[PDB]
Amino acid sequence: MRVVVIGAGVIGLSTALCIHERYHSVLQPLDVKVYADRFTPFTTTDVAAGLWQPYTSEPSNPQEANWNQQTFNYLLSHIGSPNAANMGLTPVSGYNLFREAVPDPYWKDMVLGFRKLTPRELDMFPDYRYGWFNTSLILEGRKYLQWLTERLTERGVKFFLRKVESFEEVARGGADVIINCTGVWAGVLQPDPLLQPGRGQIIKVDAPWLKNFIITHDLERGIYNSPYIIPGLQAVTLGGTFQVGNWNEINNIQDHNTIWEGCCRLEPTLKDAKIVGEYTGFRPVRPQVRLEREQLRFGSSNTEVIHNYGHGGYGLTIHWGCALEVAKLFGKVLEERNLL
């Protein structure tokens, strides 16, 4: 069959791989090709902190909780492998600081070693009087993409720099099945008011002495609209902005002072940190992830399409689960066509 994936982010490449690994043996020419107007490190995936943590609230679709859980285990099963770090994967323990007592997250048991913070530990962060501690994983979006690209390439998959203007051209181009992993820009290919950008700015800095992630929470200003320090492989990520509706791709000094001044107050040792870089990205916000099939006829050419976008600020946290689901829906596309 001829598969066409649009999107070179974590959802694009992970879904492409998951599809190939699943049906390359049963399907003869499985022409999977990737179409993107910008590849790594130019994606939102590259700008991501990398940490594995869903929101503090339950998703509207419990399927997502399932997909997160599946993504943790998939990545957890890699801990103990020599190529874990080369995939951009490594463990990290950390805190979630609250200005007041909050209920446990739904993902409390998904993560490793969850427990509430003792007052003795809160003494480290005076601005907050409640929190959680747990162990999770780092999935450096950039490193993970270079890996997936490296993996898919050897799988025979071809990448093409192309801004898809419509599903039309792709279908008539020869696409038997089209996987739409276009993120926050999906509305172009097909209008969806539910998808809005969740602008975020970060400050990548050299502060290697920082091992633990630290995520503070302001219940009034919204999720990730509070400072956070999230260590990665080669650097640390400082952030604290989530602006929904903002399409400004430029870094503003206003947010630079909120992040820095906030993070530096969180961790005073940050004063010695050498700023490596600063970026801005658009989290694909949607009331719920769009992962479903859709048939599209274009003059007899009934082209099947499967969407997978709207992952907001948990794209790396949910990538494998969602990808596994697309492959499941791709099987049904294969069997209704009697192609299996």
Ligand X SMILES: Cc1cc2nc3c(=O)[nH]c(=O)nc-3n(C[C@H](O)[C@H](O)[C@H](O)COP(=O)(O)OP(=O)(O)OC[C@H]3O[C@@H](n4cnc5c(N)ncnc54)[C@H](O)[C@@H]3O)c2cc1C
Ligand Y SMILES: O=C([O-])C1=[NH+]CCC1
Binding-site residues from annotation for D-serine: 224, 228, 283, 313
Q: By CB neighbour count within 10 A (0-12 exposed, 13-18 middle, 19+ buried), where does 107 fall?
A: buried
**Residue that has been written with the tokens 């947010």 in this structure:** 255
Element (H, E) at 144: helix 141-154
Q: Is 167 in the site for ligand X (CB under 6 A)?
A: no
Residues 227-266 that bind ligand X (CB under 6 A): 239
| Residue count, binding to ligand X (CB under 6 A) | 45
Question: Least distance to ligand Y from the beta carbon of 230, Å?
Answer: 6
Calpha distance 51→265 (Å, rounded):
21
Q: Pick the binder of ligand X from 23, 314, 320, 330 (CB under 6 A).
A: 314
Token pair recorded at residue 125: 């962060």
What is residue 21's DSSP assignment? H
Nearer Cβ to a second copy, position 41 or 91?
91
Question: Least distance to a second copy from the beta carbon of 213, Å?
Answer: 9
* 218-257: burial string, b at 16+ Cβ within 10 Å, e else: beeeebbbbbbbbbbeebbbbbbbbbeebeeeeeeeebbe
Which one, of 307, 312, 305, lies nearest residue 290 by Cα? 307
User: What does the per-residue mask of binding to ligand Y show for 305-334, with x meaning CB under 6 A?
Assistant: --------x---------------------
Q: What is the maximum alpha-carbon separation in the chain?
A: 69
Amino acid letter, residue 324: L
Collect all residues with Cβ–Cβ distance below 8 Å to 81 and sequence separation of at least 6. Answer: none
Nearest residue relative to ligand Y (C-beta)? 313
Residue 105 site contact among ligand X, a second copy, ligand Y, none (CB < 5 to 8 Å, cut-off depends on kind): none
Q: Is 48 in the site for ligand X (CB under 6 A)?
A: yes
- Give CA angle at 178 (175, 181), nearest 5°: 145
Residues 220-249 that bind a second copy (CB under 8 A): 231, 233-234
Question: Least distance to ligand X from the beta carbon of 185, Å?
Answer: 4
Which one, of 337, 23, 297, 32, lies nearest residue 178 by Cα? 32
Which residues are known binding-site members for FAD? 8-11, 37-38, 43-45, 49-51, 163-164, 182, 283, 312-313, 315-317
Residues 245-274 that bind ligand Y (CB under 6 A): none
Residues counted in the chain: 340
User: What does the per-residue mask of binding to ligand X show for 3-42, with x meaning CB under 6 A?
Assistant: ---xxxxxxx----------------------xxxxx---
- The residue ranges of DSSP E strands in the chain, in sequence order, are 2-6, 31-36, 89-98, 112-116, 130-139, 158-161, 177-180, 196-206, 213-217, 228-231, 236-239, 243-244, 274-285, 290-297, 302-309
Residue 251 site contact among a second copy, ligand Y, ligand X, none (CB < 5 to 8 Å, cut-off depends on kind): none
Q: Pick the binder of ligand X from 33, 44, 98, 324 (CB under 6 A).
A: 44
Question: Cis bond leading into 41, ω under 30°?
Answer: yes
Q: Is 110 in the site for ligand Y (CB under 6 A)?
A: no
Q: Is 81 in the site for a second copy (CB under 8 A)?
A: yes
Q: Is 324 in the site for a second copy (CB under 8 A)?
A: no
Question: Least distance to ligand Y from the beta carbon of 283, Å?
Answer: 6
Q: Is 70 in the site for a second copy (CB under 8 A)?
A: no
Q: Is 94 in the site for ligand Y (CB under 6 A)?
A: no
Q: Pick the binder of ligand Y from 3, 10, 11, 51 (CB under 6 A).
A: 51
Binding region for ligand X (CB under 6 A): 6-12, 35-39, 43-45, 47-51, 141, 163-164, 181-185, 188-189, 200, 202, 239, 281-284, 309, 311-317
Binding region for ligand Y (CB under 6 A): 49, 51, 53, 200, 224, 228, 239, 283, 313
